Ligand binder design. Sequence first.
Ligand SMILES: Nc1ncnc2c1ncn2[C@@H]1O[C@H](COP(=O)(O)OP(=O)(O)O)[C@@H](O)[C@H]1O
Ligand SMILES: Nc1ncnc2c1ncn2[C@@H]1O[C@H](COP(=O)(O)OP(=O)(O)O)[C@@H](O)[C@H]1O
Ligand SMILES: Nc1ncnc2c1ncn2[C@@H]1O[C@H](COP(=O)(O)OP(=O)(O)O)[C@@H](O)[C@H]1O
Ligand SMILES: [Mg+2]
Ligand SMILES: [Mg+2]
Lengths: 187, 371, 371, 65
Amino acid sequence: LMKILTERGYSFVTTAEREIVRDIKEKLCYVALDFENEMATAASSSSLEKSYELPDGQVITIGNERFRCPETLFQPSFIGMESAGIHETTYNSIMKCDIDIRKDLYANNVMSGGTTMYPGIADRMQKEITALAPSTMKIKIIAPPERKYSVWIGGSILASLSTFQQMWITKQEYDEAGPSIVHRKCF
Amino acid sequence: TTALVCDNGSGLVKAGFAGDDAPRAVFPSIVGRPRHQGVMVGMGQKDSYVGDEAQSKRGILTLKYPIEHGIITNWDDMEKIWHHTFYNELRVAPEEHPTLLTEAPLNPKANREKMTQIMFETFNVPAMYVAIQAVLSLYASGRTTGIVLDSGDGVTHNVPIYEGYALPHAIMRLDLAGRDLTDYLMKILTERGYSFVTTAEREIVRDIKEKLCYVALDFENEMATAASSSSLEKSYELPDGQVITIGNERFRCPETLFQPSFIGMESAGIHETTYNSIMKCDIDIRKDLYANNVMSGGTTMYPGIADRMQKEITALAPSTMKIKIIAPPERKYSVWIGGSILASLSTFQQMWITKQEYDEAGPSIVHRKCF
Amino acid sequence: TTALVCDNGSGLVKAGFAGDDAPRAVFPSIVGRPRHQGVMVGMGQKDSYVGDEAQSKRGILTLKYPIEHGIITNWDDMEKIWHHTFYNELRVAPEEHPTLLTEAPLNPKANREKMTQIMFETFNVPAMYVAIQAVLSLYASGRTTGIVLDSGDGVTHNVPIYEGYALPHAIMRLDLAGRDLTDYLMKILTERGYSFVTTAEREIVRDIKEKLCYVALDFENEMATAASSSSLEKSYELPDGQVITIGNERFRCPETLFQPSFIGMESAGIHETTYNSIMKCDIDIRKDLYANNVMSGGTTMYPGIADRMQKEITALAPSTMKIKIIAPPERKYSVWIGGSILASLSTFQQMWITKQEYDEAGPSIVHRKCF
Amino acid sequence: EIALQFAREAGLTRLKGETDYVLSNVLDGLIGDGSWRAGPAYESYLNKPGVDRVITTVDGLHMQR
Ligand SMILES: Nc1ncnc2c1ncn2[C@@H]1O[C@H](COP(=O)(O)OP(=O)(O)O)[C@@H](O)[C@H]1O
Ligand SMILES: Nc1ncnc2c1ncn2[C@@H]1O[C@H](COP(=O)(O)OP(=O)(O)O)[C@@H](O)[C@H]1O
Ligand SMILES: Nc1ncnc2c1ncn2[C@@H]1O[C@H](COP(=O)(O)OP(=O)(O)O)[C@@H](O)[C@H]1O
Ligand SMILES: [Mg+2]
Ligand SMILES: [Mg+2]
């Protein structure tokens, strides 16, 4: 987004400017269902454009940068990477597992983390996987609203289950085995 | 007290109570163990799965058959299978029921010796008996004369019986059965780009064979037809949503029964085995044995197999003889039905191997009170 | 006229004239296309680079392998590779020379059909023939009895031959080969912090695997030695000048061949597959098969792999038999040498598939005059 | 049936009309319709009306695009 806001005369080069651009991305960006279709609409009219207030009072307006920034999640070719998009990575991740569990793994796409919070990303994920997946299979996306803290909530659950207090690592064990104990006890 | 009948076949296990018309529990004879390392604590994982439970979770398990070619290789797995059969499907207490068993003819004697020992020590059954599957098959059909061709999952054998007298020297046995057909289909399916290598995918091939195969009346005539048009093609849906289509593989896979040389075996086809077995009996009982062919077992459920058998036997036998092939609709469970009939006969109640007898004689008693 | 032998393997393509001792042209089987934008006009950048020119300029290309697991997937890319092989590498006209092609056993039948059609339509070759790579490996060894273990980049397969008689039912095929080892080495190298994700960076991992990996005689003793000291640590210089050091990964990566469960595969290692394939043959030829193990292919060139093979098989075979592993120094080119021998024999001149024979029966002819 | 088994598997009827005239009468005696001269019909996998690219367990560990 920093490299693309230069196209409108906006320049951000310092770390404080980095945080400012990150805030803009959090507050204005969204994932377009059809990138090619949305790109035509943005170039046709000005309904998509919004305004943001910089800390020093200047006002900036961004247009197609709203949905071109999050598109790099699906087309890593934008930043020059050869790897495939996240949807195709998820598709490949399922085809590397055993044939009898693919049906269940299609129906339980769980997504978490801040980068997953973009509006509509669940629907684009669902559409892309359905395009890749067989016609008979049911694709269901699970996006709980608190997924920004799913990892912490799961840690809270696992630290409070009774059957977990036997899977700790203790200083007495550390002294005997050294730092190498972590690979042997943890996954 | 109520008797229990347990037909521990190579592929499936049939269990129930004596005097019933059908088995109460039928589950696959597979034991499965996890092959991936567990990460989620709290749910709990058993070290092994038995029966239908192992079938449902087959995507993360390796399924091992405790019985191969009719001979129990793994005994611990068979102990778990019997544990399941006794405590989770029939919901019975073994000590309060006399149990009956089946065994393929010409098997190693150590197999039945260990069976008797296990049932008299681990489960403490009050009484037991081991029968020959072909004899029970003949009981089930209400006949006392005829030649039985029982073809199950591991063993295909012939046992001629006349007027209640068997001829042991004419009994044939051939280690060519459903599992070999499944393996051959798994090999042939690679000709169309479908590759199945894992133990879970072996079960899928088995279902394909069950639901889409048939025995052609004329093999060369059928192959020509499938090479000319697409009439014989059918499509099967894989569990993940993909679709496969099989052409002449439908009738090539079962043809191994009549041409064993496909899979590299030198033996003759089952029709020729039946003819050789009939011809080894006395000349005065061949007319009755020709006209009472009884088939039973899972491998004899391919559509059209009866007609092909009749045609082949008629081609082998003299013209003036009458060939009749008997295929009752419930032949998949003929062995268990016969076992239920035998356990409910009054005269049979004197033939049990009581614990007392076993204790005095030892596991060797199975070779005297049983045929 | 002179015959050509073209061993279009999964990783490398070998070509040359029949009767010659070594292939004239060997180049990687890669078709690459640019992944950036060409901002300089006047250079006239081409669209696809094939062969060495793809490896030299791989910094701006995406590399794609048309052959994978021995099965051609991208037919246009294969067409380009064959065109390059005929014209720019051998400088010969395909229309005037007989050609011989090689294929792995148990491939889908449609694979060789399209090969035959492409050779007989696009290149208009006068004649062609398809042989199984495993058989040609035995021709180069000057032997007429033994079991071959061919392991290249895509496919590891076994084929037992006794006195010139193959046993098709004992053929083993395993899709675990050099590409899998390269991917597993990539996945393990992230433990030391080195990251490789692009196709150009795949080739560097292949080079380090070739130049540093070795098969351990005893795996557990080798691990303890690696963790105890730094004796097994070696250094490799990356193309940009940065240097990396790898430890136990030298012998962990090739260990996958013997323990496929490392990469999640269920099948057994190569040693157990070889032992099983012998044991599916007649018992009167097992002595010769134990005595004439022949290995070939690139994945066989690891230092000390033959000793591990011998130790592993001798632990499975009976104590009385002698295990002799044959690993000739040029076994990386065994298949091509065998093909050159076969195309040069006078008695092979009647086994070609000619154009006049091709059109008559269509591309289906390849399934009869070949094996 | 035996004659047709040789024809399909081995290739007894390869010449499909210009045989030795000794093999002709023997085949003509067996099957009188004279249909063996047409040749044994074979199934061609080139066309693939039902081509079904299937990613199974093993094929899913290694693909492209
Ligand atoms: N509402 C939002 N919309 C879009 N992106 C967001 C939103 N909230 C957070 N993010 C992005 O998520 C990133 C990190 O969020 P978080 O999931 O906490 O990361 P981590 O998992 O590393 O803790 C931030 O860089 C931010 O760009
Ligand atoms: N409808 C069917 N068509 C073809 N084969 C069948 C059918 N039903 C069952 N089978 C075969 O029968 C075999 C098991 O039958 P069964 O005789 O009960 O085995 P066992 O005697 O070992 O219990 C299976 O391996 C299966 O392949
Ligand atoms: N000296 C070596 N040490 C280890 N591996 C090697 C060596 N040389 C070649 N290879 C491996 O062999 C593989 C292909 O060799 P080759 O047998 O020619 O393949 P193909 O038979 O498919 O042409 C390559 O992927 C490479 O990793
Ligand atoms: Mg049975
Ligand atoms: Mg090769």
